[PDB]
């Protein structure tokens, strides 16, 4: 009926936006498809996540470029003046608005008690990731609140993943990886980040012979990213 037709049209436009590399458009099309009320398939979930990842990843990179300039400038070198701080805050505000939209959509439509473990972990990891992106730019009492929210979201996704998913599932691996980045970068807890990354890789290493070919590439990529982060965090 009308709902299904409209939804399929929005998904199709999302894929056209992807091919055009119009990730803002792609995110909004997938948001509209979510708001038709039907759960997302595996493929559709990835479309949503990649669209918003590209949008916020562009902003995060820009925000880091401006923050770097903002520090050197204030060293008396003189880019003196408020221009760098004003513009960095404009980028920061736009990024906060996208994270707010994503978090709102996860709470209003996507995070649910129902559904298989993959779906539930997928969206709770996303919630943790977007709080982590808000923490990258937050300060003061706000940063503490946001950091609490990320940990809670990641921890809930962890408990599901360690209970209901194989140690080699890519979503479980992806969750652990991003939680360990949270520990290292955001919570300033390198031991915890190293503990989690190390345990995740090791417990996945054991069950590798059972790993399937569909997710073989996904899991491999993530295990390698776990290893490189460990290499860096151990020598530091």
């Amino acid at each position: 009926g009308a709902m299904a037709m409209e939804r399929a049209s929005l998904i199709q436009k999302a894929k056209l936006a992807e091919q055009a590399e119009r990730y803002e458009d792609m995110a909004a099309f997938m948001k509209g498809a979510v708001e038709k009320g039907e759960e997302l398939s595996c493929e559709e979930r990835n479309l949503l996540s990649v669209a918003y990842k590209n949008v916020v990843g562009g902003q995060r990179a820009a925000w880091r470029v401006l923050s770097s300039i903002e520090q050197k400038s204030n060293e008396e070198g003189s880019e003196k003046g408020p221009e760098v701080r004003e513009y960095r805050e404009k980028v920061e505000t736009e990024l906060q608005g996208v994270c707010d939209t994503v978090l709102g959509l996860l709470d209003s439509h996507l995070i649910k008690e129902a559904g298989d473990a993959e779906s539930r972990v997928f969206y709770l990891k996303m919630k943790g990731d977007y709080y982590r992106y808000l923490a990258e730019v937050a300060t003061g009492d706000d940063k503490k609140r946001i950091i609490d929210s990320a940990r809670s979201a990641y921890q809930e996704a962890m408990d599901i993943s360690k209970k209901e998913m194989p140690p080699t599932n890519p979503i479980r691996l992806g969750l652990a990886l991003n939680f360990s980045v949270f520990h290292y970068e955001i919570a300033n807890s390198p031991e915890e980040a190293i503990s989690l990354a190390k345990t995740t890789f090791d417990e996945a290493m054991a069950d590798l012979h059972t790993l399937s070919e569909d997710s073989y590439k996904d899991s491999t990529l993530i295990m390698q990213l776990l290893r490189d982060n460990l290499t860096l965090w151990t020598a530091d």
Partner: peptide
């Protein structure tokens, strides 16, 4: 970007 350790991602 200034960060060497990575989150999930393809690049």
């Amino acid at each position: 970007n200034y960060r060497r350790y990575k989150s999930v991602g393809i690049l």
